[PDB]
Design a protein around this ligand. Structure first.
Ligand SMILES: [C-]#[N+][C@@H](Cc1ccc(O)cc1)C(=O)O
Length: 308
């Protein structure tokens, strides 16, 4: 029968994923139950790829652009924190080859032009971040990793000239009402914790109650836009395992993933800087490292990381 063998393969890929799971840390939660739920969730989607002897396909939306706050991050360009995370992702795909020869691939999807106005970053800066991240993949030989653009969608008419044109088309065909959004965020403690995180980060990027009010409204907007980019991808790559840089419920189709060691569930490399602390690279915010006795290190002139 050998379905035990097929289960043995897919369970190794799941067990590796689990070692890197990004979730809402709560001691009331019995993580054991969470996995048992996750196993039921993702194992079948994995097995679609093994059964057809194809590579395991992962879809991740991430690296949209670097945060504007100099206080939060060190530069506009992708620093060492991006590089290490990119390097980890591609290596994640190779260890799968040791179990499973077809291997695994991740189509990283650029989130930048989607919400670029709501986050207060120029469409031009976002574009440069994007070319750079592709270059970082070539510099580093991250073969298993791919990029998926906003331009890649056939329906947008290649509006390089007007991203706003691309923006309106995505909202029409793929967005839900912000009214329908606030409702959905508020039903579950997961939805509530997404809402706060998105509002906090937007407030942090600004750098007061009125500013907090702006973040609360901008949050529902940035959520709506990022969930549109989700449905665009939801149709394009349906059978692909879903990776997120956000914490996820154990019942979600999305699987939350960490790409660096970090004390924050929501911190991602475009909201931080890479710090070498006790011979371990850590993701921490550029201010918090400055109060730390942190010596900046720079590579190719542009600063890459802070060493402690
Ligand atoms: C999804 N998503 C992003 C949203 C974002 C990105 C960049 C930025 O400067 C501000 C907010 C995240 O939560 O990291």
């Amino acid at each position: 029968s050998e379905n035990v063998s097929l289960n043995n393969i897919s369970m190794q890929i799941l067990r590796e994923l689990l070692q890197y799971r990004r979730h809402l840390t709560d001691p009331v939660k019995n993580s054991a139950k969470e996995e048992e739920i996750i196993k039921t969730v993702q194992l079948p989607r994995i097995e679609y790829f093994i059964k057809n002897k194809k590579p395991i396909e992962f879809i991740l939306p991430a690296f949209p652009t670097k945060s504007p706050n100099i206080n939060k991050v060190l530069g506009t360009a992708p620093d060492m924190a991006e590089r290490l995370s990119l390097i980890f992702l591609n290596s994640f795909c190779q260890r799968i080859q040791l179990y499973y020869p077809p291997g695994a691939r991740i189509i990283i999807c650029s989130d930048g032009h989607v919400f670029g106005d709501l986050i207060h970053v120029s469409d031009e800066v976002i574009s440069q971040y994007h070319e750079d991240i592709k270059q970082l993949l070539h510099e580093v030989g991250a073969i298993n990793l791919s990029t998926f653009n906003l331009n890649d969608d056939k329906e947008l008419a290649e509006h390089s000239d007007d991203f706003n044109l691309q923006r309106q088309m995505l909202v029409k065909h793929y967005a839900r009402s912000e009214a329908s959004i606030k409702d959905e965020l508020l039903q579950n403690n997961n939805g509530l914790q997404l809402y706060r995180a998105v509002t906090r980060f937007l407030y942090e990027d600004s750098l007061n109650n009125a500013l907090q009010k702006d973040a609360k409204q901008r949050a529902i907007g940035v959520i709506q836009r990022s969930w549109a980019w989700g449905s665009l991808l939801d149709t394009h790559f349906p059978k692909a395992i879903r990776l997120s840089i956000h914490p996820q419920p154990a019942d979600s189709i999305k699987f939350g993933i960490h790409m660096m060691p970090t004390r924050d569930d929501w911190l991602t490399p475009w909201h931080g800087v890479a710090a070498n602390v006790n011979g371990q690279f850590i993701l921490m915010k550029h201010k918090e490292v400055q109060m730390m006795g942190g010596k900046l290190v720079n590579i190719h002139g542009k600063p890459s990381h802070y060493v402690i």
